[PDB]
Each structure stands twice: as C-alpha cells, then as structure tokens.
Amino acid sequence: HRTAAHTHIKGLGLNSSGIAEKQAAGFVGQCAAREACGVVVDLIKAHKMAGRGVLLAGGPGTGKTALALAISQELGTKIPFCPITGSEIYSTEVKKTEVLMENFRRAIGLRVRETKDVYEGEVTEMTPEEASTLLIGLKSARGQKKLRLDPSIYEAIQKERVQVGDVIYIETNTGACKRVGRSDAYATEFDLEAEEYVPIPKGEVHKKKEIVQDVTLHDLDVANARPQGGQDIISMMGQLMKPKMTEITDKLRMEINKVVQKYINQGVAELIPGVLFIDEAHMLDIECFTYLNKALESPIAPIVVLASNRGIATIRGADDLKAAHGIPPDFLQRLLIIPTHPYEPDEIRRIVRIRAQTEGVQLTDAAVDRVAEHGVRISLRYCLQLLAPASILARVNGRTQVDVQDIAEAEELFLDARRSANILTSTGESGGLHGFIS
Amino acid sequence: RDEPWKRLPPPTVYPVKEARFEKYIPPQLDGRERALAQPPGQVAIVIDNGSHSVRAGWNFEDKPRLAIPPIMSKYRDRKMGKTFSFAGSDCYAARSHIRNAFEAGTGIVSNWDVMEHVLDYVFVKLGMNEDMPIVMTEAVANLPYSRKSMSEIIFECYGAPSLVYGIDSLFSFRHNQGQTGLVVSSSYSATHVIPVYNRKALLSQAIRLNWGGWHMAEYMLKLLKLKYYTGFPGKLNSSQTEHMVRDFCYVSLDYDRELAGYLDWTGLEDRERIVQYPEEELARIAERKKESGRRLQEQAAKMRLERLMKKEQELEYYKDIQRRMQGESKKEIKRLLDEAELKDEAALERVIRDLERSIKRARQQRLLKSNWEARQRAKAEKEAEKARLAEEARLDEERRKNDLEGWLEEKRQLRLAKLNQLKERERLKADLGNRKSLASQIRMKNIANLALEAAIRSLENDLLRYDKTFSYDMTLDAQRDWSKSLLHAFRYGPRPFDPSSQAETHRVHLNVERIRVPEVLFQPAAIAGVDQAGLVEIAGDILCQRLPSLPGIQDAPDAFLRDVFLTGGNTLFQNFDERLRQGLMALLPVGAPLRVRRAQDAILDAWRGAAGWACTEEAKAAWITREEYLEKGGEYIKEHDLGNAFA
Ligand SMILES: Nc1ncnc2c1ncn2[C@@H]1O[C@H](COP(=O)(O)OP(=O)(O)OP(=O)(O)O)[C@@H](O)[C@H]1O
Ligand SMILES: Nc1ncnc2c1ncn2[C@@H]1O[C@H](COP(=O)(O)OP(=O)(O)O)[C@@H](O)[C@H]1O
C-alpha cells in the first residue's frame, strides 16, 4: 500500500439511476463529467461498440485522468484497459501507423477457461512399455500413481535430465514439465553430489484446479508472426536476429480473426472488447489522425478515450492549420467531447481532506484552510504536494499532526513554479558570472 | 546472564523400577478341582512359551495363572549343607547364578536344563499330584532339533496325552476375529511380518526382522554406557534399561525434523526425562591465608625494591661513563665503552634510556640517605607515571565527550587485532604439541643453517557500557561458558553442572534416547548397523512386490489392506501405528482403504487365542498323541494352518 497520485480514486461514485453524487468514492464535485463517464462505462459493458471516440477537454490541473482511472477501476480486472501516452507511438523499427494497431490489438481481450491437472511427485520407475508408451510412477507423500505417457511428452521429459528419483511437475493438459530436484530419500547416496535436494510433497499427487486467464489479440498476432521464446535459440546473437517488431500485415490480422471466431463458435473462448486510453492526444500528429479515421471504422475496433488539454494550437506535422484541442476537424466530428470545468474554492478543501487521509497525514483545521489558500492562489497540483513533506517536518520536531508552522516552513523550503519564475526574472537580473544563462 | 536457569522450575524426577521379586507363593489347587468337573475333550492346559514371560493356565479362563520369566538358579550352601534350586520369579532378579532357557537374542530354546526346571515350576504351581492335553507356542520357522527336544521333554520326562505347537501371534490373530490381513508382531526376540489369507498363514513368504525388545534393552544399555563417558557410579543392569525403554520411549512421527532441533535450549526442560539412583576456624584459615599472602607480598615488595635499587646503581654507573666520555679523545671513549661491554655511544644511550624508562615505570646515615633518595626517585617516577596515565585518561574522556563512532570503529579494530593475536597464540600452542608443522621444520632449518585476555575484557567492558550494538553474547567470556556448549545440554540438561553432591551425581538424563532407540524398527541399517530392512520397507516389499505376483489369491491390495493390526509386546509405544500408516500410505497406490489398528490385550492375547483354539475340532484333528510320538518319531508335524510347514 503505497500512495500514488491517484490512490484515492476508487470508482465514479454513481447512484442506481446513473446520477453522480458529490463527494463520493474519492471524487469531489465534477458532476457532469462523471455522469458522462458512467454512460461510457455502460457503453463498454453493453457490447454494442465497434469503435467510438471520446475526447476529454479541460485544462491542466483539472481531473481528466482521474476520470480515466475511475473508468479503469469501474470496469474491473476483467475487461482490458490499455493506457498509452501520445509520445509512445514513435519508434525506430516500425512505422507509427502500426503501433496504433498494436495498441488496438492489445485492447481486445480473449478469456479462456482451463482445468489444469498438475502432477507433483517423485518418479518411481521409467518403464518403456511398447517397442513408445512409457509408464511413470509418481510417488507422493500420500501415495504413488501410475501414469501413461504419450511418445511426444516423453521426448520432453527426456530432454530434461530425469533419471530415477527426480521429483517432477507434469502438466497433463498443456504437456509442460519441470524437474524440481532430487528427492531427499536419495540424498545421501553419494556424499558430495551436486543437486537440489527437496522433500517429497506432502499433498496429493493429482491436484485439479481451474484457472480463468486472458489473452490479448496482439499476443496472438505476435505468436503467429514470429516464433517466440520457446524455440527461438538463434536470438542470443542479438544484432539482426533479435525479436524486432515487424510490420504485421493486414492479411495476418484478417486470418487471426477467422481462427478466433472459429474458437468462439465452439464455445471454448469468450470475447471481451476493451478500452484504449490515449492520453495527451496533441502529441499525435496528422499522420495518425488520418489512420485513426480509418482504423476506427473496422467492426472489431475498441473504444478510444482521448485526453487533450490544449486550446487552439498548431497540429503537429502540418504547420499551416490551427484547430481546437490539437485535433483536426476532419477527426473532431467523430468524437464525443466531454467538458471538465475547474474547481471552486469550497471544493478544494474536501480534496485536501481526502488526500490527507489517504496518506495517513492527519492535521488540524487551521492548516486545511492554509493548504486551501495555496490551492486557490497557486494551483491544485502544488497544494497536494505539501501534505507529504510537512509530515516529515512534523514527526521530526516531536509532533504527530501537522500544524500551520510546518506548512509555513514547507512553503519556504519548497517553492512552486510561480515564485521561482519571479526569482528567476527579478532577482536573477544581470546575466553574468553569478546569473542564469537564458 | 542468569535468565535461562533462574525461573526454571524444580525437577520432577522418576526413580528406578528394577524388576525385583514380589512376595507371593501361592500353591493354587483350585484350578484342578474346576478342571476335573468339565466334560472330557474340553480341558487343556495352555502354555505360552514367551521369551520374556512364559505364561500358563487352563483354557476355560481368561487370565493366565502363571506369568514368569525363564530365570532359574541353583545353589549349594556349605555353611548350611544343602542344595537349593528355585526358578521363575522367585529369583530376586540377593544371590544370582541366573541362566535363561532362551538364547540371548533369539526366541529358540537351546538351554534345555533350564527349560525343564521352568516347566517343572509350572506343573508344580498349577497343581499336579498323580494328564491333560497341552497347547504350546513356539517361534516362527522353528528349528527341528528344538521341537524334537521339546517333544522329548514333554513325553518322556512328564508324561502327557497330547501336545500341539502353534505360533502365538497367529493365535492372537484368531482371537481378534480377523480373516485376511497382514499381521505385524514385534515380540521380545524378533519382529515378524506374516500375511494371512482366509485364516491361513502364508509362511512361505513371512519375513522376520532381527530386532526386538531385548535388542532395545541392550542398545539402550550401550548408549547409556557411552553417553556417561567418564564413569557413572551405578550398577547399569539390562533390566532397568528395559524399564526405562518401557515408559520413556516413543516413536516420533516425522523423525528428521524432530531430531535436528531436539537439543535446542528453548524447551529442553520438558523433553528431558531424568532418573535417580539410590566461623572461628574459617576466620583462622582466612587469617593464615592473609598472613601467608602478606609475607609473599612483603617478599615480592622487597624483591621489587631490590631490583629497582640494582637498576638505579646500574643507571648511575652508565651515566658516570657518559660523563667521563664528555671531553675525552676518541681512543679513550672506545676504551671506556669496551670496559662497559658496549659497542657504541648509541648503545650506551639506549641502555640509559631503557634503564630510565624501567625505573620511571617502577656510614649508617649515608646508607639510609641513599636508600631514602632511591625510594623518593622511585616514588617520583611512579607519581609521574600515574600523572601521565591520569592525563591520558582525562584526554580520552574529553575525546569521548566528542566523537563516539570513530571511537567505536577503533575499538572494534583493536578488538579484532587482539583476537587475531589470541588465535595466533592458540595456533602456536596447538603447533607446539605437533611436529610436521612447519614451525618445527623452520626451527630445524634454522638450527641446520646455524650448524591479552585482561585487555580484551577491559575493551569489552567499555563496549558494553557505551555501545548499544555490543551485547554480552559477543564477549570472550560468553563465547566460553557452559550455556554455549551442547554437550552439557546432552549429558546434564539446561540446569547448571553437577557440584558432586549426593543426589546429583547419581542421575541419568535422557534426551535423544527417547526417540532414537524406538526408531531402529524403521531405520535399522543406520542407527544400530543391523544390515536388514526397515519395517515399512518390509511391509511394502510384501504388499507391493510379492503378493500381486503370487498365484491363487484374488486381490492383493484390496484384501490385505483391510486389516493390518499390531500384536506383539514391543508395540505399546505412543504413536507407533500412525508411523506405519504414514509409511504404507507413502508406499501404496492412492485410494487403498488402509486401516491400521492394534489388538485389544497385546501382551495377553497370544495366550487367549490358543486358549480359545485349544478344544475345537481342528485342534482335535491336529494333536499328536503318545503312540504317534512312539511310531512316527520326534519331528512329526500335524500340518495345521497356524503351525509351521510340515517335514
Ligand atoms: N506398557 C508397555 N509399553 C511399552 N512396551 C511394553 C509395555 N509392556 C511391555 N512392553 C514390552 O513388551 C515386551 C514383552 O513382550 P512379550 O513378552 O509379549 O514378547 P513374547 O511374546 O515373549 O515374544 P516371543 O513370542 O518372541 O517369546 C517387553 O520387551 C516390554 O519392553
Ligand atoms: N474530483 C476529484 N477528486 C479528487 N481529486 C481530484 C479530482 N479531480 C482531480 N483530482 C486530482 O487531480 C490530479 C490529477 O490531475 P490530472 O487529471 O492528471 O490533470 P491532467 O489530466 O490535466 O494531467 C490528481 O492528483 C487528483 O488528486
């Protein structure tokens, strides 16, 4: 349990009728944006979505990404959520219209249920039956058990160095085997052998457990393009033979859709459409808002929550047009735009109290007003970053709770950006030996 | 540290239960009067020929009448002029000429002159004044000569209608109402494992382990003889070790974890089991020691003063030579230095400096003035040295009022240096009792070429007072104390040492012997070196490798695992059936209905089974009458399903 910048966000805090209530689940105020994000969460769960775009306006300091983490904890662990910033789309190995499709294919989720039948235990004998099939007795501390092996899983046992009485761990379903060690009954056969002597497991020999587990479609794309991990031994050279990201063509994705729809029609897997949260979308340039306008029109595309804080700025990559939000109006008509208004002075105090009781820093009511004064007069990100140093100035001076004096000391030890700009301009007047170098 | 034995409770001690006599001589004649009242064919005398305790009685009762050891003893008194010979429990174990009917370590009778008198005592104390059938037990796969000799003693010495031999563990099986199982019976002489299939013993494949309660007693005697190493003032009989094993040993469930953390200090007081065995003159001695001490101090003080005076005289002599050398020619300085046996003026200054440092550290009126001035110089030197030490102490205290860390690092380095010096000395000391050491070779090479504890305590005291990270455990004294060694915990316990008192030296402590001695049944080849297999491994060899490979039986795991029960006398240990159940659970396949239990009256059901068997139709169809002994011979075997194989 360590505090982040969004630890106190638990959920959107809605009613049963989809109406936001003030000071609920960590948020303070911000009604209409939480109502709209609740509608977005219901749209994601409704499974009637093949590409929808949601833009979040509002300047810096307001709660844009807090809404996104509220959505991410409102969906749960089940439905996948991929947060990427705009600046991650640039690479030096692939084009930047292919990393977008890699994020779209990381967004869609594919849930498979398995019943793994694991076999822990000491090998009793290695008897080749036919001349082929090789029986193995797996002795536990509860009883041994015979086991008939396929002639291909035995060539995976045999590659491992399993001889007489090594404890092993056979997966029955997936056919995965690991040699855990040599059993301690055969420990002191010789006296300085070099193995890992482990005791016989004091449980069952046949443990049957079931596991629900997810796979993203991008992992299917990578596992079908290039051999990965298992038998890819020439990758230890590194220079040309490493697993470099390659240009996954449209034909490969068009076939993987066929195969996944085949395994959904058999009732094996389940499909769950995810969320792609692209943050600070002004860093996306015009060679990607062209490609999003195509890639959202697929019948498989996930919902895209874009976040952008800028005003009428210059679209990157094409310097001769200005547009709102850094988003071209060719693309801006698709988006559902949600506003994010600033904070009143009576709605900053509650954020101070919630952020204080998240970090455990308790403080008197004469200091909450001072932190709210710095929140009104300077910024919201700065006033919340004085609750943690002042507690360090509290338990050192023989106190437990934070008073006005510790914050009056921390405002001098920890200057903000505005007073540093004033010192940088006015106090740092002459550019000489002991001056700043503009 | 006084803590580990300050709040320690007073000990709860158990005395020695030696197998003594008991004040009873009954000539019980009330059994023959009841035996002659029953109809014929249903009266028989049953004798369990046990190696530890021969039992005997009539079949129509539940408890045996006589339960005696095979001990006998014969004497002749010349002060009385009479031959004595009594046997059984009437021997006191004051005289002992004891010889037993059974061979020590094996339940095969080979001491027939004792067995004859034991049977004589049995037939006397039952009441025989004149011819009943005899049902008698023997060992598994008995030797034919022993059966021939026993049958010869039964027919020829006493005169009997019929007798029949059987295996006592199988009688306890038949009394326990089993049909098919795996009888594991740990007796006094050997531990048998016998598979029984539909009330029939499969004696072609029964296996006896060569360990038993007598081996328990003898191995316990050997380990108490080797534990108390320097000589224990007490008679260590075998029988008292047997009674120690009977009430102070239990088979541990998980042995390799219980054993390795057994002799830890925390909680040894509850593991350990302990066994008993049956001012004016001080002021005058203190004054004499004070007076002898005063005289030695006075002599030492005189010698010290004399040495100081001699050094002062020598210093004056060399200073005089130094003064005479001031202003003399280089030739006269060499003559004065040669007269003083000195090589150079530098050697003279070194001798004067050394003598001054040593003194600084340390007619009648003329002599008295010279002695008084010498004492004043010595006192002035001592006072100057004391002043110097006091100043150094003050400066050290003043420095301490300042830095402490750098001070602690210096004290740690000084401690390490002194420890290394102690180790180098210990090494030199150990090497001095040795030769190959290069130390004697370097000495011989040199001859051939020619041909602190107080300081450590002082530093530790300083670290204990000022260093919070330095504990008493890190002191040299702590690294040298009983509470550290395990051998005191192994022989004596967590209490302090024996001060050679009356009721303290005569004590035997038991720690490991509780779980080491009854463990030999499962790991024989390692603890006691008997080159055979464990009980678990024998049971697994029979259940998993021989019985499925034997034709004529239906289910090898589905039938023999229904009832595995434990019979013999060497079985009433705490947690003995559970160990065998966990071993067989580790060996058998998963799902076998294993149910290990034990008999009801483990030391007495071997008699009751032959008591209930004695007067049935199968027993009537398995007797050997007298004319059958006269015709068929001696080694004739009625093949019964409990007795051994016919020959
Ligand atoms: N309460 C008890 N706890 C543990 N052991 C006991 C107890 N009582 C008796 N014994 C053990 O039982 C043993 C006696 O067994 P028993 O006399 O039944 O063997 P046995 O039938 O004479 O053997 P065999 O058939 O070979 O002659 C003794 O060694 C004694 O240590
Ligand atoms: N309704 C709210 N309740 C509590 N904290 C909030 C709320 N809205 C914003 N915050 C705070 O704002 C900060 C996040 O600002 P952020 O949304 O990251 O701005 P931007 O999206 O412009 O980078 C977090 O520290 C969070 O504590």
TrEMBL record, chain A:
Could you tell me the Gene Ontology terms of the biological process aspect for this record? Answer: chromatin organization; DNA repair
Q: What is this protein called?
A: RuvB-like helicase
The EC number(s) given in the record are 3.6.4.12
Which InterPro entries does this one have?
Answer: AAA+_ATPase, P-loop_NTPase, RuvB-like, RuvB-like_C, RuvBL1/2_DNA/RNA_bd_dom, TIP49_P-loop
Catalyses: ATP + H2O = ADP + phosphate + H(+)
Q: Which SUPFAM superfamilies does the UniProt entry name for this protein? A: P-loop containing nucleoside triphosphate hydrolases
**What broad class describes the main subcellular location of this protein?**
nucleus
Is the keyword Transcription in the record?
yes
The record's similarity note reads: Belongs to the RuvB family.
Q: What is this protein for, i.e. what is its function?
A: DNA helicase which participates in several chromatin remodeling complexes, including the SWR1 and the INO80 complexes. The SWR1 complex mediates the ATP-dependent exchange of histone H2A for the H2A variant H2A.Z leading to transcriptional regulation of selected genes by chromatin remodeling. The INO80 complex remodels chromatin by shifting nucleosomes and is involved in DNA repair. Also involved in pre-rRNA processing.
Where is ATP bound in this sequence? Answer: 5-6, 28, 61-66, 343, 355, 381
Listed binding positions for ADP are 5-6, 8, 28, 60-66, 343, 381
> Would you name any one GO CC term?
Ino80 complex
Automatic annotation (TrEMBL), chain B:
Query: Biological process (GO) annotations?
Result: attachment of mitotic spindle microtubules to kinetochore; attachment of spindle microtubules to kinetochore; mitotic sister chromatid biorientation; protein transport along microtubule to mitotic spindle pole body
Coiled-coil intervals: 279-306
Specify which residues bind ATP 1 according to the UniProt entry for this protein. Answer: 51-53, 55, 187-189, 242, 246, 569
Q: Which domain of life is it from?
A: Eukaryota
Which amino acid positions bind ATP 2, per UniProt? 51-52, 188-189, 242
> Which residues of the sequence carry a binding annotation for Mg(2+)?
168
Q: Which GO terms describe its cellular component?
A: DASH complex; kinetochore; mitotic spindle
Q: Which keywords does this Swiss-Prot/TrEMBL entry list?
A: ATP-binding, Coiled coil, Metal-binding, Nucleotide-binding
Q: Which Pfam families match?
A: Actin (PF00022), DASH_Dad4 (PF08650)
Q: Which family does it belong to?
A: Belongs to the actin family.
In its UniProt entry, what is this protein called? Uncharacterized protein
* Source organism (scientific name): Chaetomium thermophilum (strain DSM 1495 / CBS 144.50 / IMI 039719)
